[PDB]
Curated annotation (Swiss-Prot):
Biological role stated in the UniProt entry: Involved in mRNA processing and export. Required for efficient splicing of a large set of pre-mRNAs by efficient co-transcriptional recruitment of the splicing machinery. Remains associated with the mRNP during early steps of translation elongation.
Parent-protein start and end of this portion: 196 to 275 of 414
Name under which the protein is recorded: Serine/arginine (SR)-type shuttling mRNA binding protein NPL3
Native organism taxonomy: Eukaryota, Fungi, Dikarya, Ascomycota, Saccharomycotina
Domain of life: Eukaryota
Gene: NPL3
Phosphoserine: residues bearing it: S17, S29
Amino acid sequence: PAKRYRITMKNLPEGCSWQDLKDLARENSLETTFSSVNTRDFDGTGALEFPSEEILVEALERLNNIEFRGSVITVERDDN
């Protein structure tokens, strides 16, 4: 729509899953459309999408190098 973006949500010790990352994201105030998770990286990173950069910039300032129930995630723009 007004936008289309994709972000990475990742760090190193955590093979996170879509259920896990949406759980945290709702904790944190994200929602998004969806995320590319479970497939491969070091083992398991997510990569979210939304039609409006509000949600992108949010996580880039809400989830960037945050501790995730005892793991951590670093998050960033990945198609922009």
